[PDB]
Amino acid sequence: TVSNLATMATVTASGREVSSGFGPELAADNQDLPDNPTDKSVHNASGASRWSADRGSGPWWLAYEFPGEATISSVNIAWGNTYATNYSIQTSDDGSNWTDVKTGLKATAQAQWVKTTFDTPIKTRHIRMIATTKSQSWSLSVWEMRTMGTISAVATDPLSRLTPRPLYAQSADGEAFELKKNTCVSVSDGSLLPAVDVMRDELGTSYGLKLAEGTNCPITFTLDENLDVTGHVGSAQSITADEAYTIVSDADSVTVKARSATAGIWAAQTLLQLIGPWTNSTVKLADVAFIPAVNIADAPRYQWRGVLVDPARSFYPLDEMKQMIDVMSAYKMNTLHLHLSEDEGFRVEITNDGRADGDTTDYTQLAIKSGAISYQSAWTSNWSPAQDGRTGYWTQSEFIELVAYAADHGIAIVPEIDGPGHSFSLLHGLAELNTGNSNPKPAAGEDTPAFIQSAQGRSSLATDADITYTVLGHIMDQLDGMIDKGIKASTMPASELKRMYFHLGGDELFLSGGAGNKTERLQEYLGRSGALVKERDKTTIVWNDGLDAVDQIPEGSVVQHWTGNAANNASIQKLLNQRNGKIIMSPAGNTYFPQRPGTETTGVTWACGACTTSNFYQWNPTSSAGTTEDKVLGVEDALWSEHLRSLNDAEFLMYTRMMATAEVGWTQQNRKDYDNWNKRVGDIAIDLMNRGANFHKATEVTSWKGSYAAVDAAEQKVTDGKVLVGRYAEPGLTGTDGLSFTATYTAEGGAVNLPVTPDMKQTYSQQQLKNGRLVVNGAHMNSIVDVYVTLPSDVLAADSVGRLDVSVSSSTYHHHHHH
Numbered sequence: 001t002v003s004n005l006a007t008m009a010t011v012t013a014s015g016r017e018v019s020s021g022f023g024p025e026l027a028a029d030n031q032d033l034p035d036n037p038t039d040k041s042v043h044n045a046s047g048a049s050r051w052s053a054d055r056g057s058g059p060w061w062l063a064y065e066f067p068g069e070a071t072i073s074s075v076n077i078a079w080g081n082t083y084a085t086n087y088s089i090q091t092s093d094d095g096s097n098w099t100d101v102k103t104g105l106k107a108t109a110q111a112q113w114v115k116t117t118f119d120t121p122i123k124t125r126h127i128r129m130i131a132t133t134k135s136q137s138w139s140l141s142v143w144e145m146r147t148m149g150t151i152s153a154v155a156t157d158p159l160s161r162l163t164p165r166p167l168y169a170q171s172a173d174g175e176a177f178e179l180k181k182n183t184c185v186s187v188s189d190g191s192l193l194p195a196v197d198v199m200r201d202e203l204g205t206s207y208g209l210k211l212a213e214g215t216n217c218p219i220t221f222t223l224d225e226n227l228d229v230t231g232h233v234g235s236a237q238s239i240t241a242d243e244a245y246t247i248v249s250d251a252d253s254v255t256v257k258a259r260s261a262t263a264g265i266w267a268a269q270t271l272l273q274l275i276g277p278w279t280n281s282t283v284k285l286a287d288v289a290f291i292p293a294v295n296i297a298d299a300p301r302y303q304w305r306g307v308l309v310d311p312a313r314s315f316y317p318l319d320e321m322k323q324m325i326d327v328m329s330a331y332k333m334n335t336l337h338l339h340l341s342e343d344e345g346f347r348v349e350i351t352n353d354g355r356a357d358g359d360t361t362d363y364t365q366l367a368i369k370s371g372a373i374s375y376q377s378a379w380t381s382n383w384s385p386a387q388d389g390r391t392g393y394w395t396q397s398e399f400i401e402l403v404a405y406a407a408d409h410g411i412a413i414v415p416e417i418d419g420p421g422h423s424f425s426l427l428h429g430l431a432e433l434n435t436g437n438s439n440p441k442p443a444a445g446e447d448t449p450a451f452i453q454s455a456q457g458r459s460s461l462a463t464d465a466d467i468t469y470t471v472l473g474h475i476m477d478q479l480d481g482m483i484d485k486g487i488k489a490s491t492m493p494a495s496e497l498k499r500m501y502f503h504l505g506g507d508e509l510f511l512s513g514g515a516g517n518k519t520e521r522l523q524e525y526l527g528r529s530g531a532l533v534k535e536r537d538k539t540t541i542v543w544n545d546g547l548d549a550v551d552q553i554p555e556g557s558v559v560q561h562w563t564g565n566a567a568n569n570a571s572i573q574k575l576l577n578q579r580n581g582k583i584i585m586s587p588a589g590n591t592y593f594p595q596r597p598g599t600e601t602t603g604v605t606w607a608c609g610a611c612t613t614s615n616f617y618q619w620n621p622t623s624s625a626g627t628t629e630d631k632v633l634g635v636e637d638a639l640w641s642e643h644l645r646s647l648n649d650a651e652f653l654m655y656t657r658m659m660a661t662a663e664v665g666w667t668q669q670n671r672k673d674y675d676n677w678n679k680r681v682g683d684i685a686i687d688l689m690n691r692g693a694n695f696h697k698a699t700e701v702t703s704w705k706g707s708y709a710a711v712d713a714a715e716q717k718v719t720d721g722k723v724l725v726g727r728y729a730e731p732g733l734t735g736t737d738g739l740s741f742t743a744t745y746t747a748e749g750g751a752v753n754l755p756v757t758p759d760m761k762q763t764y765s766q767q768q769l770k771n772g773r774l775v776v777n778g779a780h781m782n783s784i785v786d787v788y789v790t791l792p793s794d795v796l797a798a799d800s801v802g803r804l805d806v807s808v809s810s811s812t813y814h815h816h817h818h819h
């Protein structure tokens with residue numbers, strides 16, 4: 001049973017003819033047309049039950065806000081003596097961002113009912129008529145907009161942004177918690193200060209929040225090694241309680257309990273999402289930050305939630321690695337897998353300190369010789385950038401700082417030194433490694449083999465030579481030492497952050513050719529290498545295509561699955577079922593970021609054609625592995641850098657598909673919903689534009705939205721009356737002309753239109769090609785719009801009195817802001 005929901009709506013319009021009568025609300029009073037409605041004396045009676053709109057260029061719009069979720073079957077509009085000749089009906093969840101539901105609507109006569117039926121009733125909190133053209137110069141006339149449907153009295157859910165989707169979250173009773181400049185934070189333990197620093201690094205710049213450590217503060221962080229959220233874990237659900245946290249907030253207090261220092265950071269990242277997608281603003285905003293009153297109990301399905309980053313094909317400087325860590329942490333990723341060595345590079349300094357007795361190998365040449373090679377454009381005849389890979393390596397100091405920064409964001413480092421294949425950087429770097437059955441051999445009297453095309457995919461370390469395992473052993477110790485120095489500096493506990501795993505690789509031995517005995521090479525190498533890991537009290541990881549050595553690697557070893565169907569992989573099932581192993585899932589088609597993110601893009605096509613956010617979201621790692629939940633550690637995205645030459649171009653591939661993997665890592669199988677996730681991307685995107693992080697503007701995402709934030713104008717330089725008062729964030733702007741910015745000045749003395757200057761440093765571009773080859777940084781997101789007004793002179797030097805009125809209008813966005 002439907003009804004005209006107009007009578008309980010809060011009505012807004014683009015404007016109105018006269019302040020006296022003909023107000024927008026008179027479209028919403030559910031009154032049947034009067035007798036002789038076309039008569040000037042009926043239509044223009046001072047009390048006629050119709051909206052008379054503003055004049056000017058338009059567009060003219062009439063918007064209803066419903067006290068709840070409306071289910072609308074149809075919209076019936078009784079047009080007056082001036083009718084819309086072109087108009088649309090749009091919905092909004094937030095009241096600022098409008099989506100077309102029906103376009104190409106026309107009235108064709110005065111006092112005419114035009115009925116728009118939805119083939120499926122639409123659920124929304126807002127509906128609006130927007131008209132571009134009308135039948136006369138007279139104000140547009142609406143006797144009635146009847147919105148026929150049912151209302152459900154459900155409030156807006158301020159928990160609706162949280163990604164990943166938490167285990168339990170509900171609104172709590174009362175007003176939200178207001179953050180003031182002096183709001184301090186109390187911690188039960190010093191290992192929770194990294195959680196508070198994460199909040200401080202964002203809220204410091206954005207809202208001017210010091211968040212000083214204090215005693216008896218209204219925001220508390222309590223470490224509780226027994227914190228129990230299993231009350232919220234259904235029979236069909238599964239968690240890793242070590243990363244469990246609860247948040248209970250109200251108008252006076254925010255109470256965080258965390259099972260670990262790691263979960264403290266998770267709790268912090270949830271609070272930052274709740275505050276909103278402007279917390280990473282680079283300018284102090286004018287609006288106050290709120291934490292809504294909520295009740296959260298959260299923990300991740302999977303304990304292993306990672307990204308493989310490959311600097312080996314193309315180096316990433318430390319500052320870029322930090323920028324990836326920030327966004328990994330923001331989505332509660334807890335593992336940074338460093339593929340440090342390849343056929344085309346070694347990316348970390350290894351010194352000659354603390355070698356075994358008898359070991360005179362010069363390890364300094366590894367970085368010196370193989371840090372100065374990279375992926376070669378010329379050895380591709382495709383779309384790959386004209387530029388070779390970035391050369392270089394992290395010094396020991398930088399790598400330690402890399403570890404400390406990861407740790408302070410709750411992310412552990414897992415090193416990979418890939419062998420016995422994908423090992424050419426090791427043979428090119430160390431003369432001593434060129435011995436035994438190593439492939440290829442150096443040329444006559446050359447102590448290292450040449451970096452030439454013929455080496456790629458044919459590398460093998462000497463699986464039969466002692467020196468291979470001596471050198472491997474020394475690299476593991478140096479990595480070990482630098483990671484321990486990294487964690488120490490972090491103040492995070494070694495007991496959470498020191499990941500006792502070493503990744504040996506074992507993938508694609510001799511995929512392009514080589515010297516034969518592929519299986520014998522694998523079994524010997526991963527056997528002996530496996531023992532190096534076991535003796536260092538670590539668990540071995542190998543790629544699934546290395547499980548020729550399934551019997552040789554230690555009991556309880558881990559496979560990282562990436563190629564084929566793990567569920568029907570005999571060697572995977574034997575390791576899981578016969579050798580108490582475990583699995584990390586990185587099936588290419590769901591986790592490999594170089595797989596092109598869309599059919600409009602240029603990139604790798606073999607896994608799916610385009611592996612979209614659907615391919616990254618819509619899979620069950622445990623079912624895909626064909627094993628039981630207990631035997632699945634979790635997941636890893638893979639950033640392989642054959643074709644990657646900048647952070648910007650990496651971020652294009654990483655985002656927002658990484659936020660899908662984060663949800664696969666963390667959220668319960670039965671709380672997964674792709675459409676629900678898809679809806680949350682718009683705010684994810686607003687936060688990314690604030691971070692200055694790039695992302696693919698994927699066509700399957702339907703939640704691309706705009707957002708306005710007032711700037712704290714008192715912190716801004718006035719230059720010639722001109723000052724930054726606002727910022728507008730929307731993915732995909734090729735310019736600002738589609739937006740109309742207006743501002744008015746008034747003091748407590750003297751109404752005056754101020755000149756607005758919208759300033760967007762950069763426009764949105766998709767991938768650009770030159771001579772068939774990807775241009776580096778071709779694909780980039782438009783900037784956030786800096787909204788400047790020019791104040792008059794009389795008001796350039798008037799102390800603050802001056803409240804400002806800023807309006808932003810597009811076909812798909814409207815906001816009026818006031819402070």
Ligand SMILES: CC(=O)N[C@H]1/C(=N/OC(=O)Nc2ccccc2)O[C@H](COS(=O)(=O)O)[C@@H](O)[C@@H]1O
Pocket residue numbers: 017018038039040043044052081082138139141
């Ligand atoms: C404020 C108002 O009522 N404006 C309406 C209007 N203005 O015209 C007059 O009121 N003028 C007038 C006419 C007769 C005697 C004395 C004065 O006319 C607009 C056009 O309406 S229509 O001809 O019926 O199409 C109307 O849209 C304005 O709201």
Ligand SMILES: CC(=O)N[C@H]1/C(=N/OC(=O)Nc2ccccc2)O[C@H](COS(=O)(=O)O)[C@@H](O)[C@@H]1O
Pocket residue numbers: 422507508543562592593594595604606640641642
């Ligand atoms: C563990 C891993 O992924 N190894 C390499 C890799 N695997 O090779 C393939 O992708 N195989 C393949 C390629 C084309 C046709 C048929 C099979 O791929 C990584 C690159 O990933 S991708 O660009 O998304 O393909 C590579 O960097 C790894 O060394």
Ligand SMILES: [Ca+2]
Pocket residue numbers: 026027028029030031049050142143144
């Ligand atoms: Ca009416």
